[PDB]
Each structure stands twice: as structure tokens, then as C-alpha cells.
Design a protein around this ligand. Structure first.
Ligand SMILES: Cc1cn([C@H]2C[C@H](O)[C@@H](COP(=O)(O)OP(=O)(O)O[C@H]3O[C@H](C)[C@@H](O)[C@H](N)[C@H]3O)O2)c(=O)[nH]c1=O
Ligand SMILES: Cc1cn([C@H]2C[C@H](O)[C@@H](COP(=O)(O)OP(=O)(O)O[C@H]3O[C@H](C)[C@@H](O)[C@H](N)[C@H]3O)O2)c(=O)[nH]c1=O
Ligand SMILES: Nc1nc(=O)c2c([nH]1)NC[C@@H](CNc1ccc(C(=O)N[C@@H](CCC(=O)O)C(=O)O)cc1)N2C=O
Ligand SMILES: Nc1nc(=O)c2c([nH]1)NC[C@@H](CNc1ccc(C(=O)N[C@@H](CCC(=O)O)C(=O)O)cc1)N2C=O
Ligand SMILES: [Cl-]
Ligand SMILES: [Cl-]
Lengths: 273, 274
């Protein structure tokens, strides 16, 4: 049918590197169109620009309106900023990679919400897009650890890495329309919206050491913000299993020593600045 | 031996039934003391009264001050209302059964917090009392399901049942002093205080059906409160696998039909239904 076979919509190194993989291995420029996010400035920053890569490689920049009527197009969202409505499209070949182990942690801020809710693991999930937010049927998932001292930033860079890999693992079956999927369960399903998360976190210290530590590290993502204790930004939290007494809080020039209601030692390292 | 070998401190069916078990199998009345909770008025209601049981069975009622200097006393807290300081006690035989699968859900309101945090299971844990809240070394634990439609009240009655069972299972080894324990992990440890739970819950509907349903049923405990939707008290929530559309909300005479962002059917039953 159409010249155009695939649309990559989204941002950051997962979208750029997945687009590069399709251009190298599957489709020529003239067979691909791209929809960057509204905030893409067309320059590289701490992630690469999808808009810049597409323009550099002669791939057309399009709008959703411009692709709705393309028969059989593969629409692939990789951190795309718009919620689509499936009945706009002639094609039913609509796919997304979501940065959580669905059915948990639908919605936004998924580098914060699993840590803040005390998880030991997260995942990336390739799924069909339906009209709900991260609700469509699951094609593949890869779960991986949230290590004990990982921050939100560390978790995000794992999503980028594992998300790119799950794209490469599954894309041929998507192209060939040969994949299998399974509906999501009602149980374990959870969802967080922007209004659920205050990005300026105020720590509750009447909590376990593990909870105070998770509260701190869930907000460490320096490109956006760092959590603040007594007007100092915190760059790293370290949780040990050493008991130091209950409810410790002491400030030093370079760090705080903290424990919660169970008394395990936390070192909260101040940003050097 | 002082005369007094054991103190049962606390309340409700677990304290009464455990006391009754001790009196039947291990110690006579004149070897036991009790410290009821401050709110025990000696009346059997939806729970049995430990004060009433002790009075009816000639078991002395005491204060903590009265038992601190008692050598070798077994002190057993079963829903006891006072945080003890261990250095007050000559004895080191100090035990509690906590209504959670420790190390999770230390603190209070443990029939609310696991449901509200989307758990599929909970537990009872027998542990040594240390100076922290529910922090001491674990002796035994029994985990059991939170069934999908269980309310906070249903979970509390399961804690009472499994707690009484874990008491009977372990009491021989406590009396022998042959029990084994293990320190708690830092990992997975969680804690909720009274301030963390608003008992008049306002539901966040911009949530999955599982989360809306957990928000409703975590507060269903009619002796205390029921959650209110559109000025109606709710007595039961039922969560189904059936997709009915995203973000459904409809009020009927006897119930609401609700779904969250994933579209699964909830029936929230009003108290007024006949
Ligand atoms: C905007 C922002 C983000 N972050 C962190 C935490 C967040 O998980 C991570 C990535 O932010 P993002 O790129 O804005 O996306 P988010 O994780 O909220 O993902 C959501 O939005 C994107 C655009 C959707 O495609 C995705 N499916 C959603 O989950 O950066 C912060 O810590 N502070 C911030 O202010
Ligand atoms: C006071 C109260 C209680 N409840 C429910 C929820 C709570 O888990 C259950 C039992 O209440 P409780 O007997 O006050 O005890 P709680 O579960 O908070 O347990 C705590 O306090 C008791 C006294 C301690 O020994 C125990 N180790 C603590 O966990 O009843 C309510 O729903 N609303 C209330 O207002
Ligand atoms: N239909 C659809 N389903 C999806 O699963 C999906 C899409 N489109 N499009 C790409 C991506 C979009 N991800 C998102 C997720 C949330 C917001 C957002 O603005 N959330 C608002 C709540 C919006 C609402 O209630 O309608 C917020 O305040 O959190 C935007 C983009 N995606 C899957 O990743
Ligand atoms: N030392 C000790 N450890 C325990 O683990 C323990 C005891 N005593 N005593 C019996 C029982 C007591 N349980 C409790 C638990 C919390 C509160 C309470 O009032 N909590 C307050 C916070 C108190 C504080 O911060 O100091 C709250 O507002 O939630 C009371 C009794 N118990 C284990 O079951
Ligand atoms: Cl964005
Ligand atoms: Cl009480």
C-alpha cells in the first residue's frame, strides 16, 4: 500500500536509537515519518533530539492529523507526549513501550513512583495502545532490579536501556504482525497522575529508614530537581543495615546521618556545588 | 519464683482467648496478672473484654509499675496500648504479636494500611519486644490472603484468628525459653502512624478500579466508620474483571457503579440497602 510504513513518535535516546535501528535494518527514510514531542527543541541536550535526528536523516516531520488516514501504518510511541484516540486511525497497528512493569505504575513519573512506593524492581512493557492510559494488552515485558541506592535518574537510564532493547527484540514481529498479546489484569493495577506527585518533596521522618531513604532517592534526578534537607540539596542517599539507634538526625558539612523508626543508618550526601 | 509467672497485657478476642488458653493449660489464676487497655470498660461487645474475663476468673488487674521489678515474668502484649521501655523490666521475656507481615506495616491501623497500599496478603508476627515500634526480632510469622473483596473489618477478624493461632503454636517454647528468633531486615520495612491516615477518607477517582476499590474497602469497619460517597455510607465494595468503560460513575438507590482509569467494574453497596 502506502509509501509510509512506520511512524516513530516520542523523544529521548530510546526514540532516537530505535529510529536509527529501523533506518539501518528495516525501512528507508522515505518509508518513515516522525512526530517529536512538543518540547523537542531540535538540538541535543542530556538526551538526543528526535526532531534533529529525523531532519539530519531526511525523514519527514508530521502531525497526528497527517497519519490518521495512512492504511496499515505502524504507529510506535516511545515516550510520546500525546494521548491518542484509536478511532482516529484507519490502522489498528498502534504500539507503545511504557516505563513500568505493568499493570503497576500506569500514568506518569514512573522513575519516581516505584521507588516512592518501596519497590525492589521495575520493568519496561511493550503493549498495544488502546484508548486508556497504559491499559492495552501486553506483548512483552522485561523486569529488572531497582538496586538499593539507585536514584530516580538511575532508574530512568535503566528504562532507556531496557526499553531500547525490548524494541529491538520485538520489532520484527510487529512489522510482520505476528506478535501475541494478553489483556492486563485488574489486580495489581495502579496509576499515578501529575497531581499525585509533588515534585518538591517534603520528607516524612516518622517512617522507617528504608522509607526515608526511598523518599530521598525517588526525587534525585538532578536535570530536574534534587530533594532538599535544611536548605541543602541531596545528590545521593546510602542505606546500610547498620543499627545506629532510632530516629537519628544530624547535619554535617558534607552529609546528614539519618535513621528512622527502625534505626538503620542512612547517609544523605549533599550536592558538592 | 515470685507468685506471678505471666502478664497478659492488651485487649479483644486475641488477649481473652490467649489468657483462657494459658489458664486452661499452663498457669493458675494466682500466677497471672493482666493489664487491660485504658479503654477497656469491662463489657463484652463486638469483642470480648479482657478486664471482664480477669474479674470473672479472679485474675489480678495491675499497672506496669507493679510488674517491672518482677524477676523472670513472661510479658505478652496482645494489642496492648502502651509502648514499653525494656530497661524498666528486670525480665527480658517480653513478647508481642503484631498484626502485619513484618517487616512491613509496623505502627498502627494495620487492618487499613495493607489494603490501602494494594497488598494481596498480610500476616501476624510473633516477635520479641525491643524499644522500637514493632522492630524486635521475629520468632514466628503466618502470612494469609487479603481476599479481593475483604474489608478492613474482615482483615481484623483474620488477624484475631491467626494471631490467636500463632500464640497457641509458640507458647510452649516461650515458657521453656527454647524459642529461636531472627533480626528484622532494613529492606521492605514500612511504618504508619496515626497522623499518616485520615480516617475520613476522600476517594481519589483518578486511579485504577483496583485502587478505588482498595480505597473504599480499607475504611469499611462499621464500629468505627464507613467511607462516604455522595453523602451515602458504603458497607461493601465488589471488584470484578468485567470491563465497563473508563471512568464510570453512577449513583443508584442502593449502590454505585464505578470504574477507574482501567475500566473494571466496581459495585459499591450503600448501607441503606435493605
Ligand atoms: C518532568 C520531570 C521529570 N522527572 C523525572 C521523573 C520522570 O519519571 C522522568 C522522565 O520524565 P518525563 O520524560 O517527563 O516522563 P514520565 O516519566 O513522566 O513519563 C510520562 O510522560 C511521557 C511523556 C509519556 O510518554 C510516558 N508514557 C509517561 O509515563 O524524569 C522529574 O524528576 N522531575 C520533573 O519535573
Ligand atoms: C481506632 C480505629 C480503628 N479502626 C480499625 C483499623 C484498625 O487497624 C483496627 C483496630 O484498631 P485498634 O484496635 O485501635 O488497633 P490498631 O490496628 O491501630 O493497632 C495498633 O494499636 C494497638 C493498640 C496496638 O497493640 C497495635 N500493636 C498497633 O498496631 O480498627 C478504624 O477503622 N477506625 C478507628 O477509628
Ligand atoms: N491512548 C493512549 N494510550 C497510551 O497508553 C499512550 C498514548 N495514547 N499515547 C502515548 C503514551 C502517552 N502517555 C501519556 C500519559 C499521560 C499523559 C498526561 O497528560 N496525563 C495527565 C492526565 C490526563 C488525563 O487524565 O486524561 C496527568 O495529569 O497525569 C500524557 C501522555 N501512551 C502510553 O504511554
Ligand atoms: N517497646 C514496645 N515495642 C512494641 O513493638 C510494642 C510495645 N512496646 N508495646 C505494646 C505494643 C504497643 N503498640 C503501640 C504502637 C503505637 C502506639 C502509638 O501511640 N503510636 C503513635 C506514635 C508514637 C510515637 O511516635 O512515639 C502514633 O501516633 O501512631 C501505641 C502502641 N507493641 C507492639 O505492638
Ligand atoms: Cl515530554
Ligand atoms: Cl486501644
Amino acid at each position: 500500500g502506502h509509501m509510509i510504513k512506520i511512524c516513530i513518535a516520542g523523544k529521548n535516546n530510546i526514540a532516537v536509537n530505535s529510529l536509527q535501528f529501523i533506518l539501518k535494518n528495516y525501512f528507508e527514510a522515505d518509508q518513515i515519518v516522525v512526530i517529536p514531542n512538543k518540547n523537542d527543541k531540535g538540538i541535543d541536550s542530556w538526551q538526543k533530539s528526535l526532531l534533529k535526528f529525523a531532519l539530519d536523516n531526511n525523514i519527514k516531520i508530521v502531525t497526528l492529523d497527517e497519519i490518521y488516514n495512512i492504511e496499515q501504518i505502524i504507529f510506535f510511541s516511545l515516550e510520546f507526549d500525546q494521548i491518542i484516540k484509536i478511532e482516529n486511525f484507519k490502522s489498528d497497528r498502534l504500539f507503545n513501550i511504557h516505563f513500568s512493569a505493568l499493570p503497576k505504575y500506569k500514568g506518569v513519573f514512573t522513575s519516581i513512583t516505584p521507588i516512592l512506593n518501596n519497590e525492589l524492581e521495575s520493568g519496561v512493557t511493550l503493549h498495544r495502545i488502546d484508548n486508556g492510559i497504559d491499559t492495552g494488552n501486553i506483548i512483552d515485558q522485561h523486569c529488572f532490579p531497582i538496586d538499593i541506592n539507585d536514584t530516580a535518574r538511575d532508574l530512568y537510564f535503566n528504562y532507556l536501556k531496557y526499553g531500547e532493547s525490548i524494541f529491538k527484540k520485538n520489532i520484527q514481529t510487529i512489522i510482520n504482525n505476528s506478535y501475541k498479546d494478553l489483556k492486563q489484569t485488574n489486580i495489581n493495577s495502579s496509576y499515578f497522575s501529575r497531581k499525585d506527585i509533588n515534585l518538591v518533596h517534603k520528607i516524612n521522618f516518622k517512617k522507617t529508614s528504608f522509607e526515608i531513604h526511598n523518599q530521598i532517592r525517588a526525587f534525585i534526578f538532578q536535570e530536574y530537581q534534587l530533594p532538599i534537607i535544611n536548605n541543602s540539596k541531596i545528590i545521593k542517599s546510602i542505606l546500610a543495615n547498620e543499627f545506629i539507634g532510632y530516629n537519628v538526625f544530624e547535619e554535617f558539612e558534607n552529609y546528614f546521618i539519618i535513621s528512622g523508626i527502625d534505626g538503620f543508618k542512612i547517609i544523605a550526601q549533599k550536592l558538592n556545588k
